[PDB]
Design a protein around this nucleic acid. Structure first.
Ligand SMILES: [Zn+2]
Ligand SMILES: [Zn+2]
Ligand SMILES: [Zn+2]
Ligand SMILES: [Zn+2]
Lengths: 319, 85, 109, 160, 182, 66, 144, 88
RNA sequence: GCCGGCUAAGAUCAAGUGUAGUAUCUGUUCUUAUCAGUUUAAUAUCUGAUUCCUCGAGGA
């Protein structure tokens, strides 16, 4: 059973491309049991049109994540994080960390650091010491998260998703020291949670990108029910305050249809932090004119101006 | 012997007297009444039809939960009528 | 204040073989003795460091067995590149990836 | 005690983080300790700087020796005539060489030390060969300009 | 029919969380396992004490209340409001697991005041004005504890030196945050 | 005490664990996208996963002690 | 409206919670409760966790008014801070050897459990199988 | 808040003893008043001479004095009969 | 609190005063001792048993 795939180049070789496939062997799900794992290697020749088998390296657990890294490859073999270089008959183990909690479900790297996703813990920060050949854990989180996917936003921030339908953003404090050689039975330094949102559906894809030509960058997510959505940043305090007041007033005068509390629904597992629900806000355009006037006259505005302001932020990023 | 009834609440609306008019039945606050109080059918019957839920005098206006009790979903327990044994 | 004698924990004495069979008094002092000088001295006799793992442990053989256990655990969980590494020497250059980090130097010498 | 350096001759301008900031260029000073007095509640001029390595303490003792810090002769070290207000940068051999110019010394001199730190207390006792060397020390050395510290030589015991 | 401390320390993966009374629990194996969860601050530590959580010592006698700096710097108009919201800073905060207890309240560059009290002049434009600790470094050599430190005259040029900076440590990307207001 | 799932100073490990297993299965039955995840993972119809969870509801964590 | 003023009153509440007087701590707990329920969904979790670090040591209090105010503050923090933090504060005491600790912690846990029983599903810690019984929840370990 | 002082004594006397003794009831009332005055300030004291169980009420200004009188009067003997005391 | 200690570190049993409530004060005593059972996280608590020296007396 294949679970991971990667295409990369190795430094000790030339400009040849390779495809690595991680495979489980005799996996039982309930109760969980596996006989082993393999990593396949292919050469990807004929202008990227043909795969030819090179060798097959055995591992003692399911390789669930494979990521190119500095002319080599990182592989999560169950609980273990390993560095692997290309060899003539198999892949050569080069470095290893053995202190990740339960199970590696994802690996992402920005030039210096490595981000690890645990099946039940949220995020582990690791540094690779190029001259000492060491993988050291220097930061972790204070919450248990059932991570489904992860996306790097910049050198210090990570966007995560959950099995239970939540999205979160985690950032390293500016105090964070990268050069390391527990306080909560964990790592010495912790990461702060700067965003929490319940979506209502399980997200499996997160990606930062620009959708329209000449627009702005947004965070696009994808859901198991077939939905597509974006999270966009505010650039000024005035827009943020106006949309916050719109959400506040629409929470009371246009309550959810089946009896749910809107603020309580977006706080299903964690309280909301720094997100405005624009699907509640665009329900203003579908209210009756009397309530549209009652809402608009509190924001010191007319309904057409509110409609134009709602359309502006949407057309700035998405369609 | 100040105990809440805590029976399945029905369609009857709770009432407050002239002395308890602004009060919340659960926490005795006076700020931001938010949710209309419902009482069970044995609390609303015969001579008990209109009565203060806090004390039991003649009701004059509606009983309300406060916003603080509504946020904590304390309006989701049974009948909040104060009953003495 | 003979009453404090039994209220604070006195008249109950505990002894530790790691500390010359030194018999300590009520639990507040007995629990603190593991951090004090005499217990560190007694533990140095065997060669085992004083850490939080070796607290409330008063017997010698228990200490040496728990030290063997902790040694095995930690030594296992480290990354030892000498025995844990996969080199493929250029002797055949297309075979023999079972070379350790020492046989590679012997072949390249 | 080996990794820690005892500093002597600190004025009121010097403080506990100030000595660690001044000793940071010499080496990684991990901690700074200043014993407070009981009558005044302030530092008595002597403190300690505990570093990480002994080589950093040796470099701080060889670099910050006989320095003029806050208008005071600050010096770092490895942690019948009475002489008062003496500089801590001088040793017993240095005091014996300084006392050899006036008169002949009978034996090696001794300097009093604090029971807590043990570097320098502030007073010392030295014995001369005859009374002529003691009179020459009370005439010339009692008031001479030492290394940024006005010393005072006096008689330990005198019979009227 | 109950474990001993050393016997239970041999069974658990983390023996340093085992304590005196832990062998007297109804299920010590679950207790020690929960004591090792990668979170979960411990108990307030005064459950076994006999002094009602307020220690009558340590000299608690002290100043009543020190207002923040923003407190000091009609009564004040919207301009002093602007001042109170420009000066507003975040105070010192403890993270998730740092419980309070009775005891835990008490336990190359030089400053201008120390340089003025030590008798050292200011840095000239183009000259050599070293500190008196720099002559020993020029005579004996650089310090091995800080090899990356630079001093004017030995490793740094004289025109460097600016104000009270008599030394500089020279140790031998896309760092901009993603979504931030303009 | 009248609410099912609450504990007290005499609660054992078994009762705690079966309580959380039982309300985990009910939460899986309730949330529409968790059941989707499981039915995609084990390659079964959603009705079959629901019936399996209901059947597991009876004796989760095995029979009790002694 | 209080979301802009929580940082200003935090040191005063610290001082009042370190005080020996009982009315001081009871009223500080009441303030914490009202502040917690006042700001909810506004991102003030840092100061509220900081203040919980000072409120929590009062759970072993016998005075009825103080413990009532402490329970009120804890149930307000359950809403403002989340049930995961509360479960993290209760875990190590749920099975303590002393019956007093167990009584107090199970009261707090039952209060946390009756409200937001559903969220706790995602927060429970992993508990390993023994020889007789299976305790791992295997479905949550699936990886698509 | 909080909760927001009368002691009842029984089995102390009988109506049959007051039929042939008109001065025994007043002496028993004076003895009960002298017993209740040692525990606190008695504001009202009544004795039911027509009750078959010998009911007597002692109302004091403070409930702590009434609780002390009920603790000191429970199980005590008065006139050869075991009298009981309770709160009100 | 002062320079390990000076018995202001705890429990308890009777009485007084007083509050809506918490409480406040006096006499005390404190096993100086051992074993078995109850119990307590451990103490605690409770439940039972257990000739000599000195100058007629005292102590063990
Ligand atoms: Zn209320
Ligand atoms: Zn009323
Ligand atoms: Zn009812
Ligand atoms: Zn010992």
């Amino acid at each position: 059973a294949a679970f991971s795939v990667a295409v990369c180049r190795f430094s000790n070789t030339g400009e040849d491309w390779y495809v690595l496939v991680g495979v489980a062997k005799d996996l039982i799900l309930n109760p969980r049991s596996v006989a082993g794992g393999f990593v396949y290697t292919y050469k990807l020749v004929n202008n990227g049109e043909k795969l030819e088998f090179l060798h097959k390296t055995p591992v003692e657990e399911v390789p669930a994540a494979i990521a190119p890294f500095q002319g080599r490859v990182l592989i999560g073999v169950g609980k273990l994080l390993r560095v692997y270089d290309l060899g003539k008959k198999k892949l050569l183990r080069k470095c290893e960390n053995k202190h990740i909690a339960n199970y590696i479900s994802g690996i992402q790297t920005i030039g210096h650091r490595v981000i690890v996703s645990d099946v039940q813990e949220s995020f582990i920060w690791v540094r690779y010491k190029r001259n000492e050949n060491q993988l050291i854990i220097f930061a972790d989180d204070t919450y248990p998260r059932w991570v489904t996917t992860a996306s790097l936003l910049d050198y210090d921030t990570v966007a995560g998703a959950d099995k239970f339908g939540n999205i979160c953003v985690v950032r390293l404090p500016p105090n964070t020291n990268d050069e390391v050689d527990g306080l909560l039975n964990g790592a010495s330094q912790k990461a702060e949670v700067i965003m929490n949102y319940h979506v209502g559906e399980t997200v499996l894809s997160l990606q930062k990108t620009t959708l329209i030509p000449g627009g702005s960058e947004s965070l696009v997510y994808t859901t198991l029910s077939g939905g597509i959505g974006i999270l966009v940043p505010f650039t000024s305090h005035e827009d943020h305050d106006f949309f916050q007041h719109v959400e506040m007033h629409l929470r009371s005068e246009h309550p959810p249809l089946c009896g749910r509390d809107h603020l309580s629904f977006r706080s299903y597992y964690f309280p909301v932090k720094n997100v405005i629900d624009g699907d509640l806000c665009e329900q203003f355009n579908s209210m009756e004119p009397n309530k549209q006037k009652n809402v608009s006259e509190e924001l010191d505005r007319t309904p057409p101006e509110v409609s134009k302001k709602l359309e502006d932020i949407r057309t700035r990023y998405a369609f | 012997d100040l105990i809440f009834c805590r029976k399945q609440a029905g369609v009857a609306i709770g009432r407050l007297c002239e002395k308890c008019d602004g009060k919340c039945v659960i926490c005795d606050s006076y700020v931001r009444p938010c949710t209309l109080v419902r009482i069970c059918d044995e609390c609303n019957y015969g001579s008990y039809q209109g009565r203060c839920v806090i004390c039991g005098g003649p009701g004059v206006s509606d009983a309300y939960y406060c916003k603080e009790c509504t946020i904590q979903e304390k309006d989701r327990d049974g009948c909040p009528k104060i009953v003495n044994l | 204040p003979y009453w404090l004698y039994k209220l604070h924990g006195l008249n109950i004495n505990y002894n530790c073989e790691i500390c010359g069979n030194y018999t300590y008094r009520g639990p507040k002092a007995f629990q603190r003795h593991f951090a004090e000088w005499r217990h560190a001295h007694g533990m140095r006799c065997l060669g085992i460091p004083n850490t939080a793992h070796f607290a409330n442990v008063t017997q010698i053989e228990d200490a040496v067995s728990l030290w063997a256990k902790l040694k095995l655990q930690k030594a296992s969980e480290r990354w030892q590149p000498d025995t844990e590494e996969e080199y493929e020497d250029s002797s055949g250059n297309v075979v023999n990836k079972k070379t350790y980090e020492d046989l590679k130097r012997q072949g390249l010498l | 005690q080996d990794a820690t350096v005892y500093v002597g001759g600190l004025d009121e301008k010097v403080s506990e983080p100030l000595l660690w900031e001044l000793f940071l260029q010499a080496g990684p000073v991990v901690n700074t300790h200043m014993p407070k007095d009981r009558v005044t509640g302030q530092h008595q001029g002597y403190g300690f700087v505990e570093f990480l390595s002994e080589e950093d303490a040796d470099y701080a003792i060889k670099i910050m020796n006989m320095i003029k810090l806050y208008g005071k002769p600050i010096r770092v070290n490895k942690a019948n005539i009475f002489i008062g207000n003496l500089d801590p940068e001088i040793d017993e051999k240095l005091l014996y060489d300084t006392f050899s110019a006036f008169g002949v010394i009978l034996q090696t001199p001794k300097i009093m030390r604090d029971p807590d730190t043990g570097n320098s207390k502030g007073y010392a006792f030295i014995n001369f060969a005859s009374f002529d060397a003691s009179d020459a020390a009370i005439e010339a050395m009692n008031g001479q300009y030492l290394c940024n510290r006005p010393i005072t030589v006096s008689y330990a015991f005198k019979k009227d | 029919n109950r474990f001993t401390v050393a016997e239970l320390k041999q069974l658990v993966a983390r023996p340093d969380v085992v304590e005196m009374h832990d062998v007297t629990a109804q299920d010590p194996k679950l207790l020690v396992h929960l004591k090792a969860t990668r979170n979960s601050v411990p108990v307030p530590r005064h459950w076994c004490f006999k002094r009602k959580y307020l220690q009558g010592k340590r000299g608690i006698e002290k100043p009543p209340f020190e207002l923040p700096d923003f407190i000091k710097r009609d009564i004040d108009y919207q301009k002093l409001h602007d001042a109170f919201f420009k000066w507003q800073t975040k105070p010192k905060l403890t993270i998730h697991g740092d419980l309070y207890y009775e005891g835990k309240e008490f336990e190359g560059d030089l400053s201008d005041e120390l340089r003025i009290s030590l008798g050292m002049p200011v840095g000239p434009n183009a000259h050599k004005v070293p500190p008196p600790w720099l002559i020993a470094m020029q005579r004996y050599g650089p310090p091995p504890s800080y090899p990356n430190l630079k001093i004017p005259g030995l490793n740094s040029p004289i025109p460097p030196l600016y104000g009270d900076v008599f030394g500089t440590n020279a140790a031998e990307i896309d760092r901009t945050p993603w979504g931030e207001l303009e | 005490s009248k609410y099912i799932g609450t504990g007290h100073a005499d609660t054992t490990k078994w009762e705690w664990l079966v309580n959380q297993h039982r309300d985990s299965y009910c939460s899986y039955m309730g949330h529409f996208d968790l059941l989707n995840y499981f039915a995609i993972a084990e390659n079964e119809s959603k009705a079959r996963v629901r019936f399996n969870l209901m059947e597991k509801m009876l004796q989760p964590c095995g029979p009790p002690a002694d | 409206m209080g979301k802009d003023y929580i940082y200003a009153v935090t040191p005063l509440l610290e001082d009042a919670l370190m005080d020996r007087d009982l009315v001081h701590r009871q009223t500080a707990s009441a303030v914490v409760q009202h502040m917690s329920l006042g700001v909810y969904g506004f991102g003030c979790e840092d100061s509220l966790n900081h203040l919980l670090n000072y409120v929590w040591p009062n759970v072993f209090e016998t005075s009825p008014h103080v413990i009532q105010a402490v329970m009120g503050a804890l149930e307000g923090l359950r809403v403002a801070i989340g049930p995961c933090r509360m479960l993290q504060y209760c875990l190590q005491g749920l099975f303590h050897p002393a019956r007093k600790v167990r009584d107090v912690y199970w009261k707090i846990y039952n209060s946390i459990y009756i409200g937001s029983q559903d969220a706790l599903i995602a927060h429970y810690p992993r508990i390993y199988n023994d020889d007789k019984n299976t305790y791992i929840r295997y479905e949550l370990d699936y990886i698509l | 808040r909080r909760a927001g002082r009368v002691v009842i004594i029984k089995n102390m006397f009988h109506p049959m003893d007051f039929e042939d003794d008109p001065l025994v009831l007043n002496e028993i009332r004076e003895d009960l008043r002298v017993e209740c005055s040692k525990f606190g300030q008695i504001r009202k004291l009544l004795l039911f001479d027509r009750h078959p169980d010998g009911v007597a009420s002692v109302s004091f200004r403070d409930p702590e004095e009434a609780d002390y009188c009920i603790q000191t009067l429970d199980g005590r003997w008065f006139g050869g009969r075991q009298i009981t005391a309770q709160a009100w």
